[PDB]
Design a protein around this ligand. Structure first.
Ligand SMILES: *[C@@H]1O[C@H](CO)[C@@H](O[C@@H]2O[C@H](CO)[C@@H](O)[C@H](O)[C@H]2NC(C)=O)[C@H](O)[C@H]1NC(C)=O
Ligand SMILES: *[C@@H]1O[C@H](CO)[C@@H](O[C@@H]2O[C@H](CO)[C@@H](O)[C@H](O)[C@H]2NC(C)=O)[C@H](O)[C@H]1NC(C)=O
Ligand SMILES: *[C@@H]1O[C@H](CO)[C@@H](O[C@@H]2O[C@H](CO)[C@@H](O)[C@H](O)[C@H]2NC(C)=O)[C@H](O)[C@H]1NC(C)=O
Ligand SMILES: *[C@@H]1O[C@H](CO)[C@@H](O[C@@H]2O[C@H](CO)[C@@H](O)[C@H](O)[C@H]2NC(C)=O)[C@H](O)[C@H]1NC(C)=O
Ligand SMILES: *[C@@H]1O[C@H](CO)[C@@H](O[C@@H]2O[C@H](CO)[C@@H](O)[C@H](O)[C@H]2NC(C)=O)[C@H](O)[C@H]1NC(C)=O
Ligand SMILES: *[C@@H]1O[C@H](CO)[C@@H](O)[C@H](O)[C@H]1NC(C)=O
Ligand SMILES: *[C@@H]1O[C@H](CO)[C@@H](O)[C@H](O)[C@H]1NC(C)=O
Ligand SMILES: *[C@@H]1O[C@H](CO)[C@@H](O)[C@H](O)[C@H]1NC(C)=O
Ligand SMILES: *[C@@H]1O[C@H](CO)[C@@H](O)[C@H](O)[C@H]1NC(C)=O
Ligand SMILES: *[C@@H]1O[C@H](CO)[C@@H](O)[C@H](O)[C@H]1NC(C)=O
Ligand SMILES: *[C@@H]1O[C@H](CO)[C@@H](O)[C@H](O)[C@H]1NC(C)=O
Lengths: 217, 375, 414, 49, 49, 49, 49
């Protein structure tokens, strides 16, 4: 539905190493430049097939987007990752939950069971460009976040976004399907293993990059 | 140190491989010594320093764009300044940390400029006479008249056209400076050498962060992780990789140094022939009939300003092999017979100076019945 | 004497010879390690009442704490204590992260754990361990202590075991073409076969309590690691720093960069360790290595005199540790020790660096260093209407030697 | 025989590397000497004759 | 795979050595041919023209 | 293609040895460019047909 | 044409110029033009054989 182009947003820091005025090439999963991201609308929220990574821009101001569902089967057996994010607390749990149906309060199995991982973080999570990236690598969930001051561009804000990593909580699940925990819209951008060239600035921030898969130039 | 810095175990393991390190060090030292020798043959031709004359009465020739300028702290001519500015190279600090060092050249750029100005203040004053024996002073217009006779053109062409030739000389030198300043690809040969050296040095350093089949690229990680029986194997793999990389770099440096030595030999020959003399070899010192040259210092190189005589403004004539005056064939002594349609003259071959055909401009040989096309 | 040994000769000619390399040596040693001192949960998966089954083991995530592997290693117990990628004696010094203790029980005969890539099919359907395994394997005898947690194992799964993957529910299995609609015996047999050896005395087959630790080495925040000590932090000194397990030698200095809050290790062009983060008090320190260069011996011929003048190639003036002749003098090619600077200029005898040359001058018989002279001044009087014509000649015969052919050598192969 | 083969292979690799290095050095030196000999022949033909 | 890595590593080392030797010999031969080409260009310039 | 011809398993080990392939490719490319320059220098003296 | 612009000249006159260059006068060529041309043609024909 009204497929918007990805442009050149979705670049993060592959590892926690400070490099300055250098051109390093990494073989890491990045969102390909000038791709297509579905313009899913949520004023509703079907099961988005999480394959290998999700680009979650979802500009909004009403904070209707509370959290994110991330489950393998979403019924039983496997553990379900839930990242409910209130005004301040961003409490996360991996307890086995059926998740019931679309939320608006715990719309889950309400049975707990395998309530093992219960990290809460707490400080904060949030001109309100969410700019989230999710991926599972060798039993490690990594979330990359950044806020962009955009209040005039309806489509994707042409430019660059050096996504500083947010947290590196070690968990593990296949997460075949996922759905946003809900007047705005949320895009999804699938992740592929594309070699990238990254130009770290003199201050250590990735000012620009080129996708080494797009065109022969 | 490059194979393994501050590591006694790897250093002891390196002694089993013979004297590869000694061979590499000897080759690199020989290359450095040869590089020191290269600039001592191009520039150190004459060991006598001639100061640039203070007064400027060279008969209209400017020379201010090649002689040293006593204004800036560096005693370099404006063209030398442009050449030095155009060729430009912390990267060195990071490389230096891996056992690499850059030995400074024996001759600083100031002494290279002094040597160049010595060759330039001798060519102006004496000409080619200071490259053979003692310097014999001679006025510059007469030196240029000597050089005009070197290409078959008589002395009258210069003295009667002294102002025009001086103006053309000054304009050509100004155009040369403007061309050097404007086009950024002029000093390509000197920049390519620096680029190749820097690229090879960068490739040598980047080979240190390679596993080469071992557990880790860092030797310290391997050393303080395993017992000596296995650390020996891992360090041996790393040693073999680093040794192969160093050998490849050294061989490439040797080949590049041989090429640079050939170029330096050619440059020294060009200096000796074009600068300290007037070469009759075609296209050696510039395109056209060579007159004289001026050396200029450049970063890791030399720039020659080849002054040449190029004819222009042709005129079409009718010529005869000889002239039968009365039962005798008169051939031109020096020159060629040329008629503009009704009257026959004898002119020089490189200029149009018609003259009456007398018995002084011609010499007799036989009768006028063997030459084909006699008139 | 070092120059004499370098040339493998008792006679040294005039010149400058490169002998040995200089290197500043460390003075102190820094073993800065994180603040954590509380002990790790060892014995929770070691001194446990029961372990898990091979089909479904337990993956305990050891977290931030001090892990004293020495206590486990030196104990007079266990068996087949084989550590892959690490050495048990050096297990304490290394500072790991993400150690995942796996506890479970297998049969007495195997005790293999798929160690490098072992092809044994007992654990090929139960528990596969990756080839690049930087951990340790420990096996314990359980015959005396309730030979009941042997439980069961996966007889077959018609599928290979992906490394470090756990399969729990295996009910449907078949070998014949008939679909397994609740039929086990006719098609083949149902999986998850049981093992009964709770008492008994069968030697060589008593259940073994096998526990493996899988450390995750290399660059990491290094949450859980060993019981080392902590030394103070000295700046601008050649030290043997050991930051969070990163061993090396260099001069740690207060930084100026803008290290991002999530970044730990600093690099630069060509990927060398330019910066580091201090585990206790988070601060960035640039690590430039201690200075070094090439020692050169400017010596006249030993026939003339037995005096030398050392030239350290790169050390400025103060990094200096013959060796000292009360004549220290700074050049553009490093510190020159043993030669006196003479303002007068002569022709170069022994080249040194960027314009500096050294020679043996009698007028005391000491080595002097000067600036080379290009040539004799011959200020020529240019003047118009004045030419100089030679009135005599001199026939001079020079010489020129050119090598033509080198020696022809052929070297056999075998 | 197995460990002897392994060590003999190591020695073979080392000696082969040494021979290759000697051959490459000889080739470079022979190129230098050939350039010098070409210069000498040109000098002879253009100054003696 | 874990046992085939050794064999393919031996093959990689051998082929790398062969390629390096070929490249070095080609570089030396190219230098010689460049010298011959420079001589030919000089001969053309100073004799044909 | 020469060392590990159409094999991902071998091509993955070829990355362990650094950038040797890049150096060989660059050397051969430089040799070819030098041959082209030699051919241009010898014959293309006067640019008037 | 290799030292500036091309100036036409009859080939016998150019041969006379070259004879002057080698030292011999103009008379030797112009008075022996047929013999020199025949020798030149014979030499070129013998080169092919
Ligand atoms: C030689 O040429 C230089 C450069 O054109 C002349 O220097 C110029 O002199 C004029 C007159 O004083 C000044 O207005 C210009 O600014 C100078 N140009 C530069 C670039 O400095 C110089 O005068 C000439 N020499 C003689 C003897 O006439
Ligand atoms: C030869 O060419 C020069 C220029 O190369 C001619 O000199 C020019 O003459 C014109 C007309 O008088 C002047 O406007 C120019 O300023 C002169 N140029 C220079 C550089 O001085 C010269 O006239 C030509 N001679 C003949 C005989 O044709
Ligand atoms: C070109 O030829 C013409 C004749 O066609 C020559 O011009 C004559 O020269 C004579 C002798 O000085 C004069 O008396 C005549 O008045 C000239 N005639 C004309 C029409 O000008 C001339 O000398 C020749 N010039 C050159 C440069 O070869
Ligand atoms: C130059 O003049 C002589 C006579 O002075 C010409 O010789 C004559 O040539 C004609 C035609 O071939 C003969 O018929 C006469 O017998 C010749 N006379 C003598 C005395 O030998 C000669 O041809 C003239 N040259 C040219 C080029 O016209
Ligand atoms: C619990 O595990 C610990 C590991 O150390 C064992 O404690 C050791 O026991 C031996 C005798 O069995 C003593 O010599 C050591 O000093 C003890 N070490 C420590 C640190 O206390 C203990 O045996 C285990 N309990 C069992 C196997 O039942
Ligand atoms: C992969 O996801 C599927 C789909 O639910 C699930 O059955 C399976 O257990 C997952 N595998 C792993 C290794 O997580
Ligand atoms: C880098 O940081 C410095 C801090 O002094 C700042 O002045 C500069 O503007 C920054 N550069 C960029 C490109 O943001
Ligand atoms: C004669 O030479 C002139 C030089 O300007 C040229 O233009 C003209 O074409 C030539 N004539 C012939 C017939 O070749
Ligand atoms: C030039 O060629 C013409 C035409 O063939 C011929 O008649 C003549 O003899 C030749 N020589 C001269 C000097 O005109
Ligand atoms: C570690 O302890 C020191 C000494 O009290 C203290 O200054 C420092 O803040 C502590 N670090 C952390 C991360 O708590
Ligand atoms: C080198 O030492 C001199 C004094 O001998 C001092 O002035 C200079 O700053 C020093 N340079 C460095 C880079 O340490």
């Amino acid at each position: 539905p009204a497929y918007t182009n990805s442009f050149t947003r979705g670049v993060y820091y592959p590892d926690k190493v400070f490099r300055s005025s250098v051109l390093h090439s990494t073989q890491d999963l990045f969102l390909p430049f000038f791709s297509n991201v579905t313009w899913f609308h949520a004023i509703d929220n079907p099961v988005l097939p999480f394959n290998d990574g999700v680009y979650f821009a979802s500009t909004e101001k009403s904070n209707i987007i509370r959290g994110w569902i991330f489950g393998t089967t979403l019924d039983s057996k496997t553990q379900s990752l839930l990242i409910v994010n209130n005004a301040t607390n961003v409490v996360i749990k991996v307890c086995e939950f059926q998740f019931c149906n679309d939320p608006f309060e715990f719309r889950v199995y309400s049975s707990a069971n395998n309530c093992t991982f219960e990290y809460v973080s707490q400080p904060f999570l949030m001109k309100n460009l969410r700019e989230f990236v999710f991926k599972n690598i060798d039993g490690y969930f990594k979330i990359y976040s950044k806020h962009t001051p955009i209040n005039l561009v309806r489509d994707l804000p042409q430019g660059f976004s050096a996504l500083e990593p947010l947290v590196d909580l070690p968990i593990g699940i296949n997460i075949t399907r996922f759905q946003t925990l809900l007047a705005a819209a949320y895009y999804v951008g699938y992740l592929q293993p594309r070699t990238f060239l990254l130009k770290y600035n003199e201050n250590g921030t990735i000012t620009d990059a080129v996708d080494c898969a797009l065109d022969p130039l | 140190m490059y194979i393994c810095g501050d590591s006694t175990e790897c250093s002891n393991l390196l002694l089993q491989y013979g004297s590869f390190c000694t061979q590499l060090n000897r080759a690199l030292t020989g290359i450095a010594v040869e590089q020191d020798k290269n600039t001592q043959e191009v520039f150190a031709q004459v060991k006598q320093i001639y100061k640039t004359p203070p007064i400027k009465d060279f008969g209209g020739f400017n020379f201010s764009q090649i002689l040293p300028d006593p204004s800036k702290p560096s005693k370099r001519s404006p063209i030398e300044d442009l050449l030095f500015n155009k060729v430009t190279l912390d990267l060195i600090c990071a490389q230096k940390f891996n056992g690499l060092t850059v030995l400074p050249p024996l001759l600083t750029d100031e002494m290279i400029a002094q040597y160049t100005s010595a060759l330039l203040a001798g060519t102006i004053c004496s000409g080619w006479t200071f490259g053979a024996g003692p310097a014999l002073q001679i006025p510059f217009p007469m030196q240029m008249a000597y050089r005009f006779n070197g290409i078959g053109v008589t002395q009258n062409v210069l003295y009667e056209n002294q102002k025009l030739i001086a103006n053309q000389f000054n304009s050509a030198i100004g155009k040369i400076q403007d061309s050097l300043s404007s086009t950024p690809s002029a000093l390509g040969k000197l920049q390519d050498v620096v680029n190749q050296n820097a690229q090879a040095l960068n490739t040598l350093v980047k080979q240190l962060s390679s596993n080469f089949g071992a557990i880790s690229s860092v030797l310290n990680d391997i050393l303080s992780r395993l017992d000596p029986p296995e650390a020996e194997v891992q360090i041996d793999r790393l040693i073999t990789g680093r040794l192969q990389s160093l050998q490849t770099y050294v061989t490439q440096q040797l080949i590049r140094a041989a090429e640079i030595r050939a170029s330096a030999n050619l440059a020294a020959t060009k200096m000796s022939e074009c600068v300290l003399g007037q070469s009759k070899r075609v296209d050696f010192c510039g395109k056209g009939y060579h007159l004289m040259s001026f050396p200029q210092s450049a970063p890791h190189g030399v720039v020659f300003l080849h002054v040449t005589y190029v004819p222009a403004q042709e005129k079409n004539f009718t010529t005869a092999p000889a002239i039968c005056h009365d039962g005798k064939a008169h051939f031109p002594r020096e020159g060629v017979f040329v008629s503009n349609g009704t009257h026959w003259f004898v002119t020089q071959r490189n200029f149009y100076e018609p003259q009456i055909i007398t018995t002084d401009n011609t010499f007799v040989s036989g009768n006028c019945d063997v030459v084909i096309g006699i008139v | 004497s070092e120059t004499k040994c370098t040339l493998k000769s008792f006679t040294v000619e005039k010149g400058i010879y490169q002998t040995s390399n200089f290197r500043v040596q460390p003075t102190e040693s820094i073993v800065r390690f994180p603040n954590i001192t509380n002990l790790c949960p060892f014995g929770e998966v070691f001194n446990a009442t029961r372990f898990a089954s091979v089909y479904a083991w337990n993956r305990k995530r050891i977290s931030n704490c001090v892990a004293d592997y020495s206590v486990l290693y030196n104990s007079a117990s266990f068996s087949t204590f084989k550590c892959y990628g690490v050495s048990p004696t050096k297990l304490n010094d290394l500072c790991f992260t993400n150690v995942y203790a796996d506890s479970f029980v297998i049969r007495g005969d195997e005790v293999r754990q798929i160690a490098p890539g072992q092809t044994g099919k007992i654990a090929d359907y139960n528990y596969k361990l990756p080839d690049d395994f930087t951990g340790c394997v420990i096996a314990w005898n359980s015959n005396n202590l309730d030979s009941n947690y042997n439980y069961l194992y996966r007889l077959f799964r018609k599928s290979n075991l992906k490394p470090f993957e756990r399969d729990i529910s295996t009910e449907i299995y078949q070998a014949g073409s008939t679909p397994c609609n609740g039929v086990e015996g006719f098609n083949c047999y149902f999986p998850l076969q049981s093992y009964g050896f709770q008492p008994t005395n069968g030697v060589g087959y008593q259940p073994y309590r096998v526990v493996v630790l899988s450390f995750e080495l290399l660059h990491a925040p290094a949450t859980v690691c060993g019981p080392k000590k902590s030394t103070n932090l000295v700046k601008n000194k050649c030290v043997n720093f050991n930051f969070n397990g990163l061993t090396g030698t260099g001069v740690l200095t207060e930084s100026n960069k803008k290290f991002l809050p999530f970044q730990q290790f600093g690099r630069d062009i060509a990927d060398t360790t330019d910066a580091v983060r201090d585990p206790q008090t988070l601060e960035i320190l640039d690590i430039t290595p201690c200075s070094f260069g090439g020692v050169s011996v400017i010596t006249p011929g030993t026939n003339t005199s037995n005096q030398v003048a050392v030239l350290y190639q790169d050390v400025n003036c103060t990094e200096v540790p013959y060796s000292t002749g009360s004549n220290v003098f700074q050049t553009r090619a490093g510190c020159l020790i043993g030669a006196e600077h003479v303002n007068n200029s002569y022709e170069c005898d022994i080249p040194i660096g960027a314009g500096i040359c050294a020679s043996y001058q009698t007028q005391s018989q000491s080595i002097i260093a000067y600036t080379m002279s290009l040539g004799a001044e011959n200020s020529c009087a240019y003047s118009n209407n004045s030419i100089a014509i030679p009135t005599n000649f001199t026939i001079s015969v020079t010489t020129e030697i050119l090598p033509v052919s080198m020696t022809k050598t052929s070297v056999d192969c075998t």
